[PDB]
Write a protein that binds this ligand. Sequence first.
Ligand SMILES: OC[C@H]1O[C@H](O[C@@H]2[C@@H](O)[C@H](O)[C@@H](CO)O[C@H]2O)[C@H](O)[C@@H](O)[C@@H]1O
Ligand SMILES: OC[C@H]1O[C@H](O[C@@H]2[C@@H](O)[C@H](O)[C@@H](CO)O[C@H]2O)[C@H](O)[C@@H](O)[C@@H]1O
Lengths: 751, 751
Amino acid sequence: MKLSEREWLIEQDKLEASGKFETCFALTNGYIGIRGINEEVFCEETPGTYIAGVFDKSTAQVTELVNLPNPIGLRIYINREFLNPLKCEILEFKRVLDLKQGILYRKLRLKDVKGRITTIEGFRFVSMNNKNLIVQKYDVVCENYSAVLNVESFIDATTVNSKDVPNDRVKHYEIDKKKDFADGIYLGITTKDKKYKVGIASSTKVLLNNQRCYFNRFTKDLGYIITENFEVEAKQGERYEIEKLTVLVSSREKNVGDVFETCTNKLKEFETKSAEKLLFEHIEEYKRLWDVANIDIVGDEVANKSVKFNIFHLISMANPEDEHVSLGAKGLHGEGYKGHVFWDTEIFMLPFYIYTNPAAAKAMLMYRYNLLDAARENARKNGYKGAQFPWESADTGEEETPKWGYDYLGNPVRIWTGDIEYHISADIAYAVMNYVRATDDIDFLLNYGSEIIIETARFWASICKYNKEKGRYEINDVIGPDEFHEHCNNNAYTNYLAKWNLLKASELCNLLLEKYPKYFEKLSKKINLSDEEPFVWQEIASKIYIPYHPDKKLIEQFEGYFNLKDFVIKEYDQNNMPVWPEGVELDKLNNYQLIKQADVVMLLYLLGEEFDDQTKKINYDYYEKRTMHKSSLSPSIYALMGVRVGETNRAYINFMRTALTDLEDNQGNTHLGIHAASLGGTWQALVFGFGGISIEKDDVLSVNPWLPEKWESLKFSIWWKGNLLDFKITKDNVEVKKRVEKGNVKLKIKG
Amino acid sequence: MKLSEREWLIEQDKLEASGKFETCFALTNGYIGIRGINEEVFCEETPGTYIAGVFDKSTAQVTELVNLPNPIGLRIYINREFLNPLKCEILEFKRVLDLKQGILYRKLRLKDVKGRITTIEGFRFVSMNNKNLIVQKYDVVCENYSAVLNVESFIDATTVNSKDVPNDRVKHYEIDKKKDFADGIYLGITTKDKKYKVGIASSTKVLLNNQRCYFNRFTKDLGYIITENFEVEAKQGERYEIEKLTVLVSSREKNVGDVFETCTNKLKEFETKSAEKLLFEHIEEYKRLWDVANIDIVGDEVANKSVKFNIFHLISMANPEDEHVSLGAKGLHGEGYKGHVFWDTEIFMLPFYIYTNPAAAKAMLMYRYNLLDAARENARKNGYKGAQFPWESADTGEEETPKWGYDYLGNPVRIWTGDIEYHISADIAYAVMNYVRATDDIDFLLNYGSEIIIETARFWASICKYNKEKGRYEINDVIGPDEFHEHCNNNAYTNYLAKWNLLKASELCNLLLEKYPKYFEKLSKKINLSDEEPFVWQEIASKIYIPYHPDKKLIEQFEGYFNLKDFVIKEYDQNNMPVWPEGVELDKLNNYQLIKQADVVMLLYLLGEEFDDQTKKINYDYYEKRTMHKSSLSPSIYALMGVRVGETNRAYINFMRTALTDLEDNQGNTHLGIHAASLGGTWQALVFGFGGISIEKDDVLSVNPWLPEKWESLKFSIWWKGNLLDFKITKDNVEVKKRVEKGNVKLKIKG
Ligand SMILES: OC[C@H]1O[C@H](O[C@@H]2[C@@H](O)[C@H](O)[C@@H](CO)O[C@H]2O)[C@H](O)[C@@H](O)[C@@H]1O
Ligand SMILES: OC[C@H]1O[C@H](O[C@@H]2[C@@H](O)[C@H](O)[C@@H](CO)O[C@H]2O)[C@H](O)[C@@H](O)[C@@H]1O
């Protein structure tokens, strides 16, 4: 294994427990996620072991992605004394995430209190090609001594969720079985709700010039921990190779009756291959993914590197073979928001996959399709019609948002997002349109897509309420993208998005009636669709209260917003993030005009075609002045609309905010997991902002870049109606190369 | 609670995990022992939770006293973040063991990274009067802030034995039950061999001016840990009282059918009393014990304090209500030698109890009596007769010595002590005589004592082998007190001790035949004793090969010893302990004349009446020159014989060695547990050495002091035939005060 080059490396400086690097160094393959802890598992680290879709409620407030037993532990002992890296003199330290090869690397040269010197060097990864597999390989040298080493692999089943919060700790599994099967050790568990079973088998061994060299292997069952141990008569200066493979299998996979037999079998297979061979296969997969998703920026090193980071995690975490899971707000990298799926996924993350690797995006939309029944059921129980998707979603598709939590002052506060942040249903509809238009995946549109757009439209129809006074439908008592303001009327974003969803749906019925009548009838039997309905949605859409006002040009975020006390940002913190104006009480945010994130501006981005350059700029200017960027969702939208109204400084400032979200820990809480929307925002800003990509009405791809001065060039690729397109953007012109063909496609350049 | 005065306090300087203070601060009441860890249980501490007599083998090499779940844990949280004392600025630290009151105390004033300042102050103890009880009480003040505190009591069932040695870790119990019974939390376990069950119930609560002030109590079952949590709205500067009682109960106690009900009931009772009330009762017990066992030294502060330490642990660890356990080589303070009972107990520890609190010594001898069947069985299986007590003894009375371990170079070595260190059987006999002579407990002698002395004599008779050449019985292929030399012939100590045991036994038969004929027949039916036997023992005793030689005067430690390569101590370490002469190979100790500890000199101490002042001094001088003091048993014997041959410097040097054994960590391994023999050696040296107590043939107590110059005075008390005697010893004369009378007793002063 040779480390990649440096533009490709992210480096931790000090050897220590780190919440931030636990997150930034999390590895995942879309099924398994492993937090970036050190191998020895220091007292203070917070391990994370997840498997997509395995959730549990038990005694907790809401269901949660389960922190499983931690399987990666590895410790060294010299004559039965544990070589503790934290109790040594660190002569050399290197620790980097290699983004090109998708591995985590560590080299250590240590000097213990008895003056012995040992180097430990190697890496781990979570196979991109083999979804159940995790691979570790470390090399040990005793530099100036001989001894008996014990190499201790272990699986630790004391892990819990919410480790550091005494009120919220829960253990979400129980152990079913522990076993030394000679070839490895096994531990398997069942969730407390009894819905999933997971099995973990693992085999370590120790070589010297490729031949097994341990004189003794023993095993220990200490109740909640099982260990596999290898004793070596180690000779000064020799190179001992440690190789540990581990397999996770869950009840979520197919024809897995006995997780114990499935694991052992699987491991037996993977063990016919070396760690190098498995790494090579791993890397081919990363090649294949980067070959399309990589994005070179010339002339800004900190940005090129940063963006690579964002993109890495994006390509690591989606698994297109899985149509029953999607991406939670923090990936598979942490327990923030507990693995729940938000609009984050459909609106911020999904575009990367649509243009980058559209199969992934298809699977993520399958996740929502498969939970239509739960969205219907959710609407029924609130008194509505259609599919009302929940604000937070897990495995079952029921609403999973907490009824309460802690505000910015650490006090209890009611949470109403799960009750009245309705826009989620439109955003999903929107994302179905958005996937389809880029892919021309008509089959998807016919069998799945249109049901979704139609069933959400039925819901918006149900909640729109008519007002004779102003002679317009309203949607009242709501929360829009700006979570700071609760129980409002006619949130602009909400109404346009509702309008949009009602319209697309009537238009879709027409398309299908005329151009696809067998499919329209398949569908009509299925969801009782009558061709009188669409007229209803049109009637409603045409009267939904949009507020302008014709001149003045300024979109009120919601009725009454302008009557609210006004504040002026001024003052930024060391990460260039807004600081609370003075006199703002953090639990009275309802009273002020400061906003948490893009809301009206969010509207301008997604419904670009409805607002002219001037309305965009007027509203962009009014709201940026007033955005606190208290979600990681925010900067990217302001970077992208920045460029689009031609304010390229505001833009680059805001871009550097989304790109550095976790690497500089902008928001103060990277330790809870990767900020996954922010990753996709970062990508969106590059491609649809600075790269000047956009979509003209009749589905013509336009390009219309606007590099920040500072960047000599920008290449990225994307997939457009089946065509894989490489753009290179210089300050002057734009190159274009169709690397894969499917029909002739219309492109429309600068200028 | 007011701390005692200072002469009475032992203090740890730095706040840290410490193997040594885990030992030195271990608290016990003779049934329960708790290692001296801090309440929070830091990553690196080694907790110890023992109950006398509960042993388990499971997958281990030999049976072991079980480290039970750890019940004392207590942590504080501020707004759900754990207040970690190791991650704070320590503004004040006090931690002392108070030897007079028998409690462990800690005051902390901390400043956490958010600048909050909190003081935590209180103590714990293991009730001397109530054997199942442990008490903790801490006071919390938030100095400069208000918050929600969580007070977290917990019982941690992840504990194992041999925590730091990967080859030897075993978990010796499994959990049977966990329970929140509203009034507390419960966890109970069963040993893996299935011989003992233990239950632990525990109840915490939190007061403010004596009234319950937590607004919420919740519980958590995290599998191998259960917690009880108390939430308080804490006001700046208020004094929150935390009080946690905990109860251990085991299957070893009587009419304990359901350990769960017995614990809960017990706790319910103890909870009708406050921590102060329980402390007061605790202290009365310590008063009562110290009132007799205390020993004032005037004019050497470091010695007075030290001796108090030694005596404290002695009075803490014996429980005279228990006739089925005795004292293991490391008390109930650690897992060194795994709670096994050696001659340490009978010869070094027992004298303290005989003279200090003779009921204790009676119970310890009951331990051996009750295992006579196992000692018979042990002799039979080696081809011998009588009772052959094992070298290491646990619950069953079978031999428990390891077949192998690691030598001084960390390599595997065969251990033969369990096969051929036979003297143990004599030492026990001896201790029975020794208890009886001080106590005049004739009843004990008749019903129990004499069986023991007789059955061991039957064994010595069986192993003595006749030699026609020298016309003497020999005992060959042996290990004597000096473990350095293996497979030797006619170890001097062994032969005199055998002779002694054969003689006492024939003499005892005579006493009983003549003066107690009903008892002699009770006994004779019981162990098939014929009045022909004693003649056999006499015949043998009179020919046992004693080596002199008439002039020269020097007792060869064993046949051939003088032909061994000779070395010269020279050079002492920073604790004034011998350093290995150069050219000595630590795994070839058989070849040299260096000895591990008192052996011939051991003989001079126990059989004083058989050697004259000159033979004593000649042999003392020859062997001290050559003793490495590589057991903690050694210094004390050399301090005591020092004074007795009149070498008072050698004496004070050696005394300061035994007294400082654990407080200065002389032997390098205090972390494994208190060196319990060394405690009793220390006492023996004071009383029978410097205090000049001795026993003239016809059981007259003589006094014949010899203070080191430096010590103005020395008072100690002792019990002699039922009379409690206070001696005060000055450089000039000796005062004496009978505080309790039982007949007139002969005393014989200086001079
Ligand atoms: O990325 C997740 C989510 O984060 C922010 O809002 C959170 C809200 O959606 C959630 O219901 C509550 C409780 O779980 O926490 C809020 O902070 C963000 O504002 C939101 O738009 C985003 O999707
Ligand atoms: O205090 C216990 C014991 O310690 C020393 O000897 C140990 C020996 O008795 C034991 O069999 C082996 C293995 O457990 O370890 C030895 O170090 C001491 O020499 C001895 O006299 C003493 O009773």
